[PDB]
Amino acid sequence: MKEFYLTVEQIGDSIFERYIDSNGRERTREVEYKPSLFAHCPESQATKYFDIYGKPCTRKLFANMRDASQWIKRMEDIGLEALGMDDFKLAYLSDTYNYEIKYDHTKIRVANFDIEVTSPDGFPEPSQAKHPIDAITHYDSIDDRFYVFDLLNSPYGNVEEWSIEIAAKLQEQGGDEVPSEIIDKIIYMPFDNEKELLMEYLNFWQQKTPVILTGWNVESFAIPYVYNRIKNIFGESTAKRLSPHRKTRVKVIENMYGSREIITLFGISVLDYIDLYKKFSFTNQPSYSLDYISEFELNVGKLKYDGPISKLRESNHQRYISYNIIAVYRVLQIDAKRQFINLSLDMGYYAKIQIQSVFSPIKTWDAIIFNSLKEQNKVIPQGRSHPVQPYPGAFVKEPIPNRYKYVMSFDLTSLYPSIIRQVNISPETIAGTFKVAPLHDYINAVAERPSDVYSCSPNGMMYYKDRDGVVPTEITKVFNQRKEHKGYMLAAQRNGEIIKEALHNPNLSVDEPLDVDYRFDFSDEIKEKIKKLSAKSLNEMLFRAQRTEVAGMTAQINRKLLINSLYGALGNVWFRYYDLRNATAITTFGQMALQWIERKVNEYLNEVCGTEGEAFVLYGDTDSIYVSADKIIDKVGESKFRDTNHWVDFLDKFARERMEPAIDRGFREMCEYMNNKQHLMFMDREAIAGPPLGSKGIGGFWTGKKRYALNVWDMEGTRYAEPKLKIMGLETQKSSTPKAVQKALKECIRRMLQEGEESLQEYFKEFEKEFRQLNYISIASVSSANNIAKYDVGGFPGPKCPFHIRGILTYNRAIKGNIDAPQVVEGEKVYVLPLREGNPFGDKCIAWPSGTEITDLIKDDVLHWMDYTVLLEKTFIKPLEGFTSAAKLDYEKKASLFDMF
DNA sequence: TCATTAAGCAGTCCGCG
DNA sequence: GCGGACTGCTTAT
Ligand SMILES: Nc1ncnc2c1ncn2[C@H]1C[C@H](O)[C@@H](COP(=O)(O)OP(=O)(O)OP(=O)(O)O)O1
Ligand SMILES: [Ca+2]
Ligand SMILES: [Ca+2]
Ligand SMILES: [Ca+2]
Ligand SMILES: [Ca+2]
Ligand SMILES: [Ca+2]
Ligand SMILES: [Ca+2]
Ligand SMILES: [Ca+2]
């Protein structure tokens, strides 16, 4: 096989590399890598190295990396550009792996671990590590085994061995329901003292040294705790054995309002799964406890135990250990679904970076671009210092608040990366500037043509047309990869809808799910077989289809994220190719493009309907437009349609055969106007929305910018078995909104869009009557909790104290003295509830850590003093009044003349 | 929450005769 | 009460 790196580090004048050799063996080497950097040199000197602007460079070969680093400094002292890759390990990887890396994940040791620490006096601080580690579960991807290190003897209690037999039993038998598919994969090791446990763990670690190290909060808790505990017990040199190169560093993580300390293990790639989840999942969750995320992702039930976690080991050690094993497994189950490890390896090896650098699009793109240029013997510029400056973004149209019955939306494919490619926007393709007219003048095609030579953006920037810049070239490659995975995702989605239809008529038989690739549209034969399957098989197939769709979603949306972040990096001062001219050239071009096509679509439709000045485009945001289709439907007349699917077909056909060609013509004209390199403005029909045929549903509504709801029948070629609510920005979509209120508001919207005013009034009336029964957690608001200290004045709200912070302070007084009650953690999330006048807490609200039950001694008081009236008005009625006043509907029946009888 | 602009709403503080 | 100046937080893109 072709070799690939596993990890790479720089330690002084040495590169330390762990790699897979041509035989599949993991190896490690120390290499005295001699880096090269570059300086400009006279034109009259023969060279093969040129900077990105075509200026000649001389290569400087250094005896060692420290010499290269010192040279960079002296070049700053002289005031001359020191060119080339200054991150020497990236240069090492580029020299060592000078081909497209083909990796084999089955050779990469992925470790997933979790530790338990019994602590009576509150949260066990990883920097102190004053309490024994009493359980470690460490899953190894190469062995496919869960290694369980169990401490039987502690200052906090001596316990019996964990029993695998009881762990396997159902909870109804007194067991722990450890999933049977992992029972045989458990290797259990009990220890009668902590020192031998940790010593054996380190020997184990040495034998099976993680390459990828993951788990849940392992970077902030598990790793620093293990490291510091071993340090406290044995000394530093022993703790450093967690690094295969025996080097570690306490790294300070600086945010906006303070800092925390992580341990950097040289030669390990730490990908904390919480951090992967936050970056790649595209969710915002009310809580990030493993129980909460597990329930959300896998629909598995919460890990149930009596009493505090600090008493679980002594009271029920059996369950203590089993829950530790399950926690590690749940992360593996999340990854099996979401596939973020796979994604990280894909991206990491593509860019030729340390795998942990996938969190940084700036680092990722710096390495892609460097490797690309190096192939042509071109030399990257030195990174420079820049002040942070604001710059303009996307255009968002102000919509008229209203109901909108029939809506068809159109959308530009991967807009900003398409703009980069169309205009040819790159650091080295800048050709000059032109005198800019007001944007309006370009939108309306009255401004002078910017250039007859160069490719232009309406911000005044001109670009070369003779050859692609490195940014357009490299963005296209990832764009094309994305397209492939998006294809699989959509096929899987369309396949899901076929199964859902079939499920309406399941066959009474015993059979099996079909062995099929869900990434490809089902053949006619597969469709025929599906129509004969039982519910059991169909549901299994549905689960598999939806799993395939999720996998495709991960692959496509995060490739989209990486390419959009290249645009974003152009506006980040730390990016090597930071340039606000280029960042603004993209956004301004986008502003023109959207408003240009709004004008074109209006003109086209006014033409077909024989009108003038009618506004068909009701809304747009960045890259997409929403067109009122009422007049199109009215032109054939509703009574002419057989069913809903009939007008959806008609609108689908009108969009594809009439509107898309007109939209294309508009954009091709715009391309010529800006003299762009290549026409890449591809705007296709996105959504078809409207009420069910012959219903009183309103179909859709806008309340404002970034706030709307549509009843969608077809989305990007997926024809849904059941209409799907597309709701953007409204309270149903916000993590801050109580769970039960999201649900209620969503049902209110469903009724508005599908059934109409009367149905909405029925539901509202019932919700208002019953809501006081809802579980307190489900009706709690959620908020992140920053700067608690800032607003804490002697335990009371200081000036300008936010409502949620006030709640936390109330909570802190209620639990005062109690080290055992959960503390609210700065920067994490809290549930928030209002409190009625004259309550014992002495304030108008209380807040406690999210994803948790509030502590028992104050729970009964919270439940007794909860202000349901304020809760209802703030979270439910206020937003609903916003939806209904926009839609010109009443959520409560107005009095009529019929009330006389 | 270490990690690539537009614009909405909640809430504080305070003016608005 | 609302709405502007402002902080805080959270979405859409
Ligand atoms: N997370 C982000 N970071 C930077 N720019 C973004 C981000 N999300 C969106 N944008 C910008 C760049 C996008 O091209 C543009 C419109 O985004 P969006 O509507 O999500 O889809 P898209 O047009 O980029 O891709 P698609 O092909 O899926 O439509 O807005
Ligand atoms: Ca735990
Ligand atoms: Ca788009
Ligand atoms: Ca699209
Ligand atoms: Ca059937
Ligand atoms: Ca869009
Ligand atoms: Ca098209
Ligand atoms: Ca009480």
PDB file of N, CA, C and O in Angstrom, chain A residues 371-415:
ATOM      1  N   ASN A 371      -0.020  23.457  -0.662  1.00  0.00           N
ATOM      2  CA  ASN A 371       0.253  22.238  -1.422  1.00  0.00           C
ATOM      3  C   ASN A 371      -0.032  22.387  -2.908  1.00  0.00           C
ATOM      4  O   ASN A 371       0.722  21.881  -3.745  1.00  0.00           O
ATOM      5  N   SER A 372      -1.118  23.089  -3.232  1.00  0.00           N
ATOM      6  CA  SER A 372      -1.455  23.380  -4.617  1.00  0.00           C
ATOM      7  C   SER A 372      -0.373  24.218  -5.313  1.00  0.00           C
ATOM      8  O   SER A 372       0.079  23.886  -6.413  1.00  0.00           O
ATOM      9  N   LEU A 373       0.038  25.299  -4.664  1.00  0.00           N
ATOM     10  CA  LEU A 373       1.032  26.201  -5.240  1.00  0.00           C
ATOM     11  C   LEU A 373       2.409  25.549  -5.349  1.00  0.00           C
ATOM     12  O   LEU A 373       3.099  25.700  -6.366  1.00  0.00           O
ATOM     13  N   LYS A 374       2.789  24.805  -4.310  1.00  0.00           N
ATOM     14  CA  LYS A 374       4.062  24.084  -4.276  1.00  0.00           C
ATOM     15  C   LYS A 374       4.241  23.167  -5.487  1.00  0.00           C
ATOM     16  O   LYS A 374       5.353  23.011  -5.985  1.00  0.00           O
ATOM     17  N   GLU A 375       3.138  22.585  -5.963  1.00  0.00           N
ATOM     18  CA  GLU A 375       3.136  21.737  -7.162  1.00  0.00           C
ATOM     19  C   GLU A 375       3.615  22.447  -8.425  1.00  0.00           C
ATOM     20  O   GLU A 375       4.109  21.806  -9.354  1.00  0.00           O
ATOM     21  N   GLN A 376       3.453  23.764  -8.459  1.00  0.00           N
ATOM     22  CA  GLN A 376       3.865  24.581  -9.597  1.00  0.00           C
ATOM     23  C   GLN A 376       5.130  25.382  -9.279  1.00  0.00           C
ATOM     24  O   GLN A 376       5.456  26.356  -9.973  1.00  0.00           O
ATOM     25  N   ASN A 377       5.843  24.961  -8.234  1.00  0.00           N
ATOM     26  CA  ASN A 377       7.041  25.667  -7.745  1.00  0.00           C
ATOM     27  C   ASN A 377       6.799  27.125  -7.361  1.00  0.00           C
ATOM     28  O   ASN A 377       7.702  27.969  -7.434  1.00  0.00           O
ATOM     29  N   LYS A 378       5.572  27.416  -6.948  1.00  0.00           N
ATOM     30  CA  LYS A 378       5.209  28.754  -6.514  1.00  0.00           C
ATOM     31  C   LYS A 378       5.344  28.887  -5.003  1.00  0.00           C
ATOM     32  O   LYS A 378       5.237  27.903  -4.265  1.00  0.00           O
ATOM     33  N   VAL A 379       5.585  30.113  -4.556  1.00  0.00           N
ATOM     34  CA  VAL A 379       5.945  30.392  -3.174  1.00  0.00           C
ATOM     35  C   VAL A 379       4.880  31.254  -2.492  1.00  0.00           C
ATOM     36  O   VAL A 379       4.564  32.346  -2.966  1.00  0.00           O
ATOM     37  N   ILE A 380       4.349  30.764  -1.372  1.00  0.00           N
ATOM     38  CA  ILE A 380       3.301  31.469  -0.627  1.00  0.00           C
ATOM     39  C   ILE A 380       3.841  32.719   0.072  1.00  0.00           C
ATOM     40  O   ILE A 380       5.002  32.739   0.484  1.00  0.00           O
ATOM     41  N   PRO A 381       3.008  33.777   0.184  1.00  0.00           N
ATOM     42  CA  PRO A 381       3.458  35.010   0.835  1.00  0.00           C
ATOM     43  C   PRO A 381       3.512  34.842   2.347  1.00  0.00           C
ATOM     44  O   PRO A 381       2.875  33.930   2.892  1.00  0.00           O
ATOM     45  N   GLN A 382       4.260  35.711   3.018  1.00  0.00           N
ATOM     46  CA  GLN A 382       4.280  35.706   4.476  1.00  0.00           C
ATOM     47  C   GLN A 382       2.958  36.216   5.031  1.00  0.00           C
ATOM     48  O   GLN A 382       2.330  37.109   4.451  1.00  0.00           O
ATOM     49  N   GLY A 383       2.550  35.643   6.161  1.00  0.00           N
ATOM     50  CA  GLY A 383       1.403  36.138   6.908  1.00  0.00           C
ATOM     51  C   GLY A 383       1.689  37.511   7.479  1.00  0.00           C
ATOM     52  O   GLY A 383       2.772  37.749   8.028  1.00  0.00           O
ATOM     53  N   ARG A 384       0.719  38.411   7.339  1.00  0.00           N
ATOM     54  CA  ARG A 384       0.847  39.777   7.836  1.00  0.00           C
ATOM     55  C   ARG A 384      -0.192  40.121   8.911  1.00  0.00           C
ATOM     56  O   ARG A 384      -1.201  39.420   9.078  1.00  0.00           O
ATOM     57  N   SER A 385       0.088  41.206   9.628  1.00  0.00           N
ATOM     58  CA  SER A 385      -0.769  41.738  10.670  1.00  0.00           C
ATOM     59  C   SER A 385      -1.824  42.658  10.053  1.00  0.00           C
ATOM     60  O   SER A 385      -1.519  43.474   9.181  1.00  0.00           O
ATOM     61  N   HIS A 386      -3.069  42.521  10.492  1.00  0.00           N
ATOM     62  CA  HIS A 386      -4.140  43.406  10.018  1.00  0.00           C
ATOM     63  C   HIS A 386      -5.071  43.790  11.146  1.00  0.00           C
ATOM     64  O   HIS A 386      -5.421  42.937  11.973  1.00  0.00           O
ATOM     65  N   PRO A 387      -5.499  45.066  11.180  1.00  0.00           N
ATOM     66  CA  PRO A 387      -6.554  45.451  12.123  1.00  0.00           C
ATOM     67  C   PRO A 387      -7.885  44.839  11.692  1.00  0.00           C
ATOM     68  O   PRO A 387      -8.162  44.776  10.491  1.00  0.00           O
ATOM     69  N   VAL A 388      -8.681  44.374  12.655  1.00  0.00           N
ATOM     70  CA  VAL A 388     -10.026  43.871  12.381  1.00  0.00           C
ATOM     71  C   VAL A 388     -10.922  45.035  11.943  1.00  0.00           C
ATOM     72  O   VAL A 388     -11.062  46.029  12.660  1.00  0.00           O
ATOM     73  N   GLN A 389     -11.500  44.907  10.751  1.00  0.00           N
ATOM     74  CA  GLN A 389     -12.390  45.916  10.186  1.00  0.00           C
ATOM     75  C   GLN A 389     -13.706  45.282   9.709  1.00  0.00           C
ATOM     76  O   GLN A 389     -13.695  44.165   9.182  1.00  0.00           O
ATOM     77  N   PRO A 390     -14.843  45.989   9.900  1.00  0.00           N
ATOM     78  CA  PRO A 390     -16.140  45.536   9.362  1.00  0.00           C
ATOM     79  C   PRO A 390     -16.198  45.625   7.836  1.00  0.00           C
ATOM     80  O   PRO A 390     -15.469  46.409   7.231  1.00  0.00           O
ATOM     81  N   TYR A 391     -17.054  44.820   7.214  1.00  0.00           N
ATOM     82  CA  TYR A 391     -17.270  44.915   5.780  1.00  0.00           C
ATOM     83  C   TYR A 391     -18.681  44.390   5.474  1.00  0.00           C
ATOM     84  O   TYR A 391     -19.213  43.603   6.252  1.00  0.00           O
ATOM     85  N   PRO A 392     -19.291  44.829   4.354  1.00  0.00           N
ATOM     86  CA  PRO A 392     -20.698  44.494   4.086  1.00  0.00           C
ATOM     87  C   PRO A 392     -20.948  43.056   3.637  1.00  0.00           C
ATOM     88  O   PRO A 392     -20.081  42.431   3.017  1.00  0.00           O
ATOM     89  N   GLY A 393     -22.148  42.561   3.934  1.00  0.00           N
ATOM     90  CA  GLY A 393     -22.519  41.189   3.641  1.00  0.00           C
ATOM     91  C   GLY A 393     -23.647  41.078   2.634  1.00  0.00           C
ATOM     92  O   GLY A 393     -23.706  41.828   1.658  1.00  0.00           O
ATOM     93  N   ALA A 394     -24.551  40.141   2.896  1.00  0.00           N
ATOM     94  CA  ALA A 394     -25.601  39.776   1.958  1.00  0.00           C
ATOM     95  C   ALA A 394     -26.742  40.790   1.946  1.00  0.00           C
ATOM     96  O   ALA A 394     -26.902  41.575   2.890  1.00  0.00           O
ATOM     97  N   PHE A 395     -27.532  40.750   0.875  1.00  0.00           N
ATOM     98  CA  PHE A 395     -28.770  41.500   0.797  1.00  0.00           C
ATOM     99  C   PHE A 395     -29.916  40.630   1.279  1.00  0.00           C
ATOM    100  O   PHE A 395     -30.014  39.458   0.910  1.00  0.00           O
ATOM    101  N   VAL A 396     -30.768  41.225   2.111  1.00  0.00           N
ATOM    102  CA  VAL A 396     -31.987  40.600   2.579  1.00  0.00           C
ATOM    103  C   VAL A 396     -33.138  41.576   2.304  1.00  0.00           C
ATOM    104  O   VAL A 396     -33.122  42.719   2.780  1.00  0.00           O
ATOM    105  N   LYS A 397     -34.119  41.122   1.526  1.00  0.00           N
ATOM    106  CA  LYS A 397     -35.284  41.936   1.184  1.00  0.00           C
ATOM    107  C   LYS A 397     -36.245  42.038   2.361  1.00  0.00           C
ATOM    108  O   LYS A 397     -36.499  41.040   3.039  1.00  0.00           O
ATOM    109  N   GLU A 398     -36.766  43.243   2.599  1.00  0.00           N
ATOM    110  CA  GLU A 398     -37.842  43.440   3.567  1.00  0.00           C
ATOM    111  C   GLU A 398     -39.159  42.894   3.008  1.00  0.00           C
ATOM    112  O   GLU A 398     -39.693  43.440   2.038  1.00  0.00           O
ATOM    113  N   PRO A 399     -39.700  41.819   3.615  1.00  0.00           N
ATOM    114  CA  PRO A 399     -40.961  41.337   3.072  1.00  0.00           C
ATOM    115  C   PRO A 399     -42.152  42.105   3.666  1.00  0.00           C
ATOM    116  O   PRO A 399     -42.089  42.588   4.805  1.00  0.00           O
ATOM    117  N   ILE A 400     -43.223  42.226   2.893  1.00  0.00           N
ATOM    118  CA  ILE A 400     -44.492  42.720   3.430  1.00  0.00           C
ATOM    119  C   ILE A 400     -45.090  41.614   4.316  1.00  0.00           C
ATOM    120  O   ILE A 400     -45.365  40.513   3.828  1.00  0.00           O
ATOM    121  N   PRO A 401     -45.268  41.891   5.628  1.00  0.00           N
ATOM    122  CA  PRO A 401     -45.848  40.845   6.478  1.00  0.00           C
ATOM    123  C   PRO A 401     -47.243  40.478   5.977  1.00  0.00           C
ATOM    124  O   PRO A 401     -48.057  41.357   5.697  1.00  0.00           O
ATOM    125  N   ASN A 402     -47.493  39.185   5.823  1.00  0.00           N
ATOM    126  CA  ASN A 402     -48.730  38.718   5.218  1.00  0.00           C
ATOM    127  C   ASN A 402     -48.763  37.216   5.151  1.00  0.00           C
ATOM    128  O   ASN A 402     -47.734  36.552   5.342  1.00  0.00           O
ATOM    129  N   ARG A 403     -49.952  36.682   4.885  1.00  0.00           N
ATOM    130  CA  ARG A 403     -50.067  35.327   4.402  1.00  0.00           C
ATOM    131  C   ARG A 403     -49.650  35.327   2.941  1.00  0.00           C
ATOM    132  O   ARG A 403     -49.805  36.340   2.240  1.00  0.00           O
ATOM    133  N   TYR A 404     -49.091  34.201   2.504  1.00  0.00           N
ATOM    134  CA  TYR A 404     -48.802  33.966   1.097  1.00  0.00           C
ATOM    135  C   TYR A 404     -49.256  32.557   0.755  1.00  0.00           C
ATOM    136  O   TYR A 404     -48.753  31.583   1.321  1.00  0.00           O
ATOM    137  N   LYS A 405     -50.227  32.468  -0.153  1.00  0.00           N
ATOM    138  CA  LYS A 405     -50.926  31.213  -0.423  1.00  0.00           C
ATOM    139  C   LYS A 405     -50.077  30.222  -1.233  1.00  0.00           C
ATOM    140  O   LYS A 405     -49.719  29.155  -0.731  1.00  0.00           O
ATOM    141  N   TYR A 406     -49.759  30.581  -2.475  1.00  0.00           N
ATOM    142  CA  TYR A 406     -48.904  29.764  -3.327  1.00  0.00           C
ATOM    143  C   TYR A 406     -47.529  30.408  -3.469  1.00  0.00           C
ATOM    144  O   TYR A 406     -47.415  31.551  -3.909  1.00  0.00           O
ATOM    145  N   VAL A 407     -46.492  29.679  -3.066  1.00  0.00           N
ATOM    146  CA  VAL A 407     -45.120  30.186  -3.150  1.00  0.00           C
ATOM    147  C   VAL A 407     -44.217  29.193  -3.863  1.00  0.00           C
ATOM    148  O   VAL A 407     -44.274  27.991  -3.614  1.00  0.00           O
ATOM    149  N   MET A 408     -43.398  29.718  -4.764  1.00  0.00           N
ATOM    150  CA  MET A 408     -42.331  28.954  -5.365  1.00  0.00           C
ATOM    151  C   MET A 408     -41.022  29.670  -5.129  1.00  0.00           C
ATOM    152  O   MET A 408     -40.903  30.868  -5.407  1.00  0.00           O
ATOM    153  N   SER A 409     -40.049  28.944  -4.592  1.00  0.00           N
ATOM    154  CA  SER A 409     -38.750  29.541  -4.326  1.00  0.00           C
ATOM    155  C   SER A 409     -37.709  29.065  -5.327  1.00  0.00           C
ATOM    156  O   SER A 409     -37.819  27.960  -5.881  1.00  0.00           O
ATOM    157  N   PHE A 410     -36.726  29.931  -5.572  1.00  0.00           N
ATOM    158  CA  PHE A 410     -35.615  29.631  -6.458  1.00  0.00           C
ATOM    159  C   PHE A 410     -34.315  29.945  -5.744  1.00  0.00           C
ATOM    160  O   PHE A 410     -34.260  30.839  -4.900  1.00  0.00           O
ATOM    161  N   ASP A 411     -33.274  29.187  -6.073  1.00  0.00           N
ATOM    162  CA  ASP A 411     -32.052  29.227  -5.305  1.00  0.00           C
ATOM    163  C   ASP A 411     -30.782  29.052  -6.135  1.00  0.00           C
ATOM    164  O   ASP A 411     -30.693  28.146  -6.967  1.00  0.00           O
ATOM    165  N   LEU A 412     -29.794  29.902  -5.872  1.00  0.00           N
ATOM    166  CA  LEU A 412     -28.485  29.792  -6.506  1.00  0.00           C
ATOM    167  C   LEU A 412     -27.660  28.708  -5.818  1.00  0.00           C
ATOM    168  O   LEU A 412     -27.549  28.697  -4.596  1.00  0.00           O
ATOM    169  N   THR A 413     -27.091  27.798  -6.606  1.00  0.00           N
ATOM    170  CA  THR A 413     -26.263  26.719  -6.088  1.00  0.00           C
ATOM    171  C   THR A 413     -24.970  27.294  -5.544  1.00  0.00           C
ATOM    172  O   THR A 413     -24.321  28.116  -6.205  1.00  0.00           O
ATOM    173  N   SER A 414     -24.634  26.884  -4.322  1.00  0.00           N
ATOM    174  CA  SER A 414     -23.370  27.224  -3.667  1.00  0.00           C
ATOM    175  C   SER A 414     -22.899  28.610  -4.101  1.00  0.00           C
ATOM    176  O   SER A 414     -21.898  28.742  -4.825  1.00  0.00           O
ATOM    177  N   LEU A 415     -23.645  29.632  -3.677  1.00  0.00           N
ATOM    178  CA  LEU A 415     -23.511  30.970  -4.259  1.00  0.00           C
ATOM    179  C   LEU A 415     -22.115  31.587  -4.150  1.00  0.00           C
ATOM    180  O   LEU A 415     -21.503  31.893  -5.175  1.00  0.00           O
TER     181      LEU A 415
END
